[PDB]
Enzyme design. Sequence first.
Site, PDB file in Angstrom:
ATOM      1  CG  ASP A   1      -1.697   1.307   1.353  1.00 17.54           C
ATOM      2  OD1 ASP A   1      -1.267   2.188   2.123  1.00 17.54           O
ATOM      3  OD2 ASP A   1      -2.741   1.450   0.688  1.00 17.54           O
ATOM      4  CE  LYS A   2       4.501   5.470  -3.986  1.00 18.72           C
ATOM      5  NZ  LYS A   2       4.249   6.891  -3.637  1.00 18.72           N
ATOM      6  CB  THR A   3      -0.218   6.904   0.941  1.00 18.26           C
ATOM      7  OG1 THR A   3      -1.478   6.232   0.982  1.00 18.26           O
ATOM      8  CG2 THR A   3      -0.062   7.584  -0.398  1.00 18.26           C
TER       9      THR A   3
ATOM     10  N   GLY B   1      -4.405   3.538  -3.001  1.00 15.97           N
ATOM     11  CA  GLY B   1      -5.687   4.211  -3.059  1.00 15.97           C
ATOM     12  C   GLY B   1      -5.523   5.662  -3.448  1.00 15.97           C
TER      13      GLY B   1
ATOM     14  CE  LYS C   1      -5.738  -0.283  -1.485  1.00 15.20           C
ATOM     15  NZ  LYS C   1      -5.285   0.481  -0.306  1.00 15.20           N
TER      16      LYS C   1
ATOM     17  CG  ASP D   1      -0.258   2.725   6.634  1.00 17.47           C
ATOM     18  OD1 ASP D   1      -0.946   2.596   5.603  1.00 17.47           O
ATOM     19  OD2 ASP D   1       0.174   3.821   7.035  1.00 17.47           O
TER      20      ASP D   1
ATOM     21  CG  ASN E   1      -7.685   2.861   3.253  1.00 16.11           C
ATOM     22  OD1 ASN E   1      -6.958   2.799   4.240  1.00 16.11           O
ATOM     23  ND2 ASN E   1      -7.829   3.966   2.541  1.00 16.11           N
TER      24      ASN E   1
HETATM   25  F1  ALF Z   1      -1.677   4.131   0.795  1.00 15.09           F
HETATM   26 AL1  ALF Z   1      -3.365   3.642   1.127  1.00 15.09          AL
HETATM   27  F2  ALF Z   1      -5.065   3.170   1.453  1.00 15.09           F
HETATM   28  F3  ALF Z   1      -3.714   3.662  -0.633  1.00 15.09           F
HETATM   29  F4  ALF Z   1      -2.986   3.574   2.880  1.00 15.09           F
HETATM   30 MG   LIG Z   2      -1.485   3.472   3.955  1.00 15.72          MG
END
Ligand code: ALF
Ligand SMILES: [Mg+2]
Lengths: 816, 324
Positions: free
Chosen positions: A383-385, A416, A520, A541, A544
Amino acid sequence: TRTVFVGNHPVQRFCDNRIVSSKYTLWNFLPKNLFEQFRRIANFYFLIIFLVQVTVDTPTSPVTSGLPLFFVITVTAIKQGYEDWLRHRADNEVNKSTVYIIENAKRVRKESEKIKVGDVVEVQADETFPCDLILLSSCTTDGTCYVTTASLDGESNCKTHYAVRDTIALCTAESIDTLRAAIECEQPQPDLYKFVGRINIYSNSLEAVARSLGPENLLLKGATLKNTEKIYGVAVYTGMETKMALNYQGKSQKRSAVEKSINAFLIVYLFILLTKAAVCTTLKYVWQSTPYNDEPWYNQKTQKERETLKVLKMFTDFLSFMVLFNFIIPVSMYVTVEMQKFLGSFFISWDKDFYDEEINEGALVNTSDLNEELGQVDYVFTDKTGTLTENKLQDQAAETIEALHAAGLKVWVLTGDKMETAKSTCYACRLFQTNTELLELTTKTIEESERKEDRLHELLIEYRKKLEHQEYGLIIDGSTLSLILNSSQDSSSNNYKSIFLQICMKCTAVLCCRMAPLQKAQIVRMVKNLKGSPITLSIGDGANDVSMILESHVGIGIKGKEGRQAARNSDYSVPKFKHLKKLLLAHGHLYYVRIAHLVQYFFYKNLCFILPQFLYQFFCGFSQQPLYDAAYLTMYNICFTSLPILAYSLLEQHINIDTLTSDPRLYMKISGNAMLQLGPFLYWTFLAAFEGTVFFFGTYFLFQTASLEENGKVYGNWTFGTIVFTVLVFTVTLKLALDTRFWTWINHFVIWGSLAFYVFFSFFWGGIIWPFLKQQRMYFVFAQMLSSVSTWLAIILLIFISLFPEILLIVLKNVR
Amino acid sequence: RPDNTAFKQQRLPAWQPILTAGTVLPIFFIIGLIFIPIGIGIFVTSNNIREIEIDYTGTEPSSPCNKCLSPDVTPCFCTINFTLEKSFEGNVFMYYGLSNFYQNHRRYVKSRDDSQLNGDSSALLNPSKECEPYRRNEDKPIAPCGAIMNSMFNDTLELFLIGQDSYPIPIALKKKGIAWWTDKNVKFRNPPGGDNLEERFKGTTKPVNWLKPVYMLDSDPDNNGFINEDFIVWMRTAALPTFRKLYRLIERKSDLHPTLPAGRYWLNVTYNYPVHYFDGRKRMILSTISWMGGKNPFLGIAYIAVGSISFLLGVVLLVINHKY
Ligand code: ALF
Ligand SMILES: [Mg+2]
Ligand SMILES: *[C@@H]1O[C@H](CO)[C@@H](O)[C@H](O)[C@H]1NC(C)=O
Ligand SMILES: *[C@@H]1O[C@H](CO)[C@@H](O)[C@H](O)[C@H]1NC(C)=O
């Protein structure tokens, strides 16, 4: 939907204030544990045997299968008992702590469970909130308390919490005097921030301003108050309904590939048992046909047995062969595999490399049943961010994806976020190398549905197969991917989906942008299904990333800055992303090898045990006579050969743990469930069939001598089965001593201590063990077997003949 | 912060054997030089062991023991004259073999009452129910109950050396010292109290097939009942259908003469034990004993075949590494 009345001045449906995290209760522990244990194959199969032994007349006493079974069910309870007496003591402190309550202008201190919905609660400095409160008022001016959510969502800032603006005037003064308040609250939801309140505190005339109280007034359960003399709230959720108790979500992800192979070997080893018993029955009645081969006048049947129905004897003779060979299924495997997982998942949280000086927290084990799934991962879903970029990449979020690509995995970054904020940073995340041809299915180039069906086709039928780790990386978005899965049931000639699954298998880098939280869990579910079972991991983290953390084969939740929602639904949780290297590569590789070599050895050391007892039936009158004593059919699996494989599976590094994180290059790639495929399975089966034939037919040729001593005295069938057992215990023990490439001071204590116990026991069981037995069948059988120079030489030889095909591999595995 | 101990961090001090050709190939030579010199000192020891067997079951119309092969007048005496080419040197052990005799059959092995033979005054007058078909008869308990103690080998073998003239020299055989010292002095005792034995075995009957009760198995009080060595040797079961049990032992002479000098002998059997039915054989076996036991080549041949394959493999295995 509910309405709370604080002051009992009016103008059930809700539960009490008691949290339970346990599974068993003292009233129903035994019936609820014994049921869930005797629901497993090798636990139910050993109960069917134990019942067959006490009704039917069988070769072996019921102690040989009721002592190892009762001892294995008891240890697997004491573990699951104490492992659950914690949850009592863990919550006993939480719902037995004193809290003050104003029942009617009377400030009493009750216990946290005695709290009912809708009453006045006083919490002085530094006490956890007993229940999900609504801060009607605070004592100081302006009514503000500083409560940090150190446990709920992991944050450590002093979040502000305002008192109800209208009633900050209420300062500790006799809250029963017409304090009618209608708090029309909504049913619980686990959002932990979203809460709509509605205060209608009746004044002398009227007051119903809909103050939508929320995260500023909702004082959550189990969050310690800080630097406030005392506060005054009222409970609107009282546990099992509060937001803190609405985030448990415990369910059964725990099904490893090494725990669904154990069942494939039990299904095999049960057909070996139905064949050993059906062969030896067909042969018992072909042999018994000659009238002097049953009751040959020296052992003559009794009147009862000589008149039993032949159709029934053919059945009891079959049960007596299942009972005789019943040890071919290992009894003490279930207790050893799960005692190793418990005591073994401590190296994953004790590790000082999983320690963050900022968070000041380590790793975490929520389930100890997927330990071996860390060393079998084939895909990774990130998960990128938050995981790859903190709140620019993280400390080592670029060198880890190298170590995850060198190790052969396939990293998929399900973000996301947008595309250019993700991809153009993925050019830094270093999953996309510089000379990587990128094939993009994003919306800014696919603004036409049918072109995509051609796009799928032209980049595949004329591009992807008419010309690859450093070569191709797919890039999708949330929109164009939706059509490939949502509505892919129109044309069955060449689907949108079946073609998409051809590049998702070979593309090592994939980046799905603008993914809703519900896609996902689609992408993991789609990948989990194709061409066998790609064991997928998912690390995230945020909240989502709880769909895919619950979906995948193992879920690693990052203790991030957003909250502990992904970190508490996951299986293991690590406070960084760079801890993915040491987790998969060093801990997963070691956790799998330790249990895949304990599983093979548990089935091996039992076939070496029974094959000399199956062969003996040809030299007995197929009359199901146990080759070994009774005190050896029980102790073998629980006493003589139990600890050396347990200590192995806890302390054994077949590649030094520092050259494992340093070198992923192949080390992870070596085992794609390799150690338990059909290749190695019938190397241990055909090595245990060779070692079983050698134990018997080396003691069979040895007993053609007319004496093995110098005083010319002969041996019986108990000094025959003891020579086979002595060679059998020393082989399977010295077979493990040939496989340990990491000899601790414990691998010396349990291996050379299990060989010296079998020798101390056999010399002790052959002394004063008389009064309670009707056998004395092994009185001096060990101590005489060793007074003959020819029997030491046979045992020393048959141990080496048996360990030859294993030494022959070691040499041919060193060389070239 | 986590406890930075050796054990918890998986960095315990270990050994980790690094297996190199300079350490794994010599293995195939430090045995081939050890297993072969043992496989030759055994094969030579098992060759210098002089033994001779005689199958006296009958079943051959030309055999002297065919007259009592048949169910006839019971005290048959058949004599078989064998001959020793080479004299027997040390002390000699006379056995008796039996074939197609499953003393290891399950219904047979369990058919003893060990607390009886161990001298329980309680179990003497009520034997177990394992020893069932032979537990009682005529409303009385069998003294050594069981199928193991019922079918006891009961024909008498004697040896006669024919001297320079035509007359036979009787070779003296010894009965004592043929059972394990433990299960003659410990595991097998008489009933508890009594000056003479016939009174101890009071409310019990001899087994169905025996002709004399246990207390009449001998004369000296050290071999009489439950202690009789020919009885203790028969109880210890076979482990195989074709077995043999020590019968007598011949003590070496203090002179410089052989124990059994060469010549023509006589084995005059008082044939009693019927094995004609279940198609079994009966043999007498004289033999000399060495430090390794009796005559058995398997140990010599197996030590050689393993000591000579590890030395061959070490040669092929040294051909590869040393040339490559
Ligand atoms: F980086 Al995300 F949900 F897309 F925590
Ligand atoms: Mg994240
Ligand atoms: C010897 O024992 C056998 C088998 O028990 C029996 O058949 C035979 O009659 C006995 N002969 C005697 C006691 O002389
Ligand atoms: C020994 O055998 C010979 C054969 O004639 C004979 O003396 C007799 O059968 C045996 N000895 C006895 C009992 O005199």
